[PDB]
Structures are given as structure tokens and as C-alpha cells.
Design a protein around this ligand. Sequence first.
Ligand code: NA
Length: 228
Amino acid sequence: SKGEELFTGVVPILVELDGDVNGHKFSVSGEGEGDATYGKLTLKFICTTGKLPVPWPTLKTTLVQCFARYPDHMKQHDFFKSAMPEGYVQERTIFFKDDGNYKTRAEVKFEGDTLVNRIELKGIDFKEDGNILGHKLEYNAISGNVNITADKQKNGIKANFKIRHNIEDGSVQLADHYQQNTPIGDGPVLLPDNHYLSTQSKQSKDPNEKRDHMVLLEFVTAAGITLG
Ligand code: NA
């Protein structure tokens, strides 16, 4: 695609999120860069409104799958880059088992040479002392396989995957994700054969940063289709 050509070197990234979870309102800003040749993302997120009222790990998926490394032989299945520069809408519902849900809407697009992710998030039906509003998650890595299907009716894609977040008492909190992406522009897109994105993230802190924040180092690689 012509959009893929936008991703052959290191691209600056900006993320801006406004959230409301059970009436707790917050905002997050992110800055970093992506290098899709290696599926590599480095980001720092800052809660601009004070302390983040939910755990950072529950926001990681919400806070740029256009930076996935697609293997050469799978490049015709990269929807995300084919929609650029005009971008796409990414919507999710994320179900926390035995707890509330996030509903997210984002637009991902170029503004100049910067890839920007602007998001709104709504959480409802959270338990006041469950794992999320009780802050019982470990500030712990996450990984998984994002399963992608074509959505021909919407000239886009669907995806579904589970995140298992470790809890401080040694249990696991499941977060079942449902996703849809649709192009913003009316230019040509690539609609993929079924495949997945193998994704892993390490979270850390800027020891010099007093604000509530998260630093991420993430790798995202398309898989599941064999050459030939
Ligand atoms: Na690159």
C-alpha cells in the first residue's frame, strides 16, 4: 500500500486520552516513537490530571497497531498502514471479568509526520473495591495474540483477544477485548486474511518523573500465515 511507505523509518507518536471510569475523570498524554520495520514502540504516558484512578496496565491496550511488523510475505494483510495517512477509527469494548467494562473510541491518523492516537474512554459498572478501582493489579508486563478478521461490510477489520492481568494476591483478572477498525478516508484499504498480532509489552518507570506515568517498550509482529 502507499500508506506502508509512511512507516519505513522511525515515526514520532502522540497519544491523548480522556477517560471517565465510574465518574472518575482523567486525562493521559503519551509521547514516543515507532519503528514498524522492527515492530518496535517506545512510549512514555503521563496522567495530566493527577493520580490515575485505574491501574496503568488496564489502559495499555487502549493507549497504534499500524506499527506492527508485517513479514514480507504477509504485507498484503496490513490493514492498519493501508488506511494511512487519513487513518482509522478503533473501537473496543473491554470486559473485566466479574467487574466493569471499558468502551473506547479512537482515531489514529497522521498529523504531518506524527502518528496521533486520540481516544475517549468510558468505564461503567466497576466494583468500588474490585481489582480495578481497588488498584490490586501488578505493574506487570502483558502479552497476547490479537486475532484479526476482515469486516467487508465496514471496509475494515474486527479483532478479539484476552489479556490476563496478574493480581497482587496471585490470582488473574481477565480482560476480554472486542475490537473493530474502520477507515476514516475513502481511499483503498487492504482487507486481510485471518491472522494475529503477537504482542508483548514491558512497563517501567522514569525514576526522575514525579508525575503518575508509565514507560513502555512494546514489540508487535504479524503472524499466522505461512509463506507460499
Ligand atoms: Na520502520
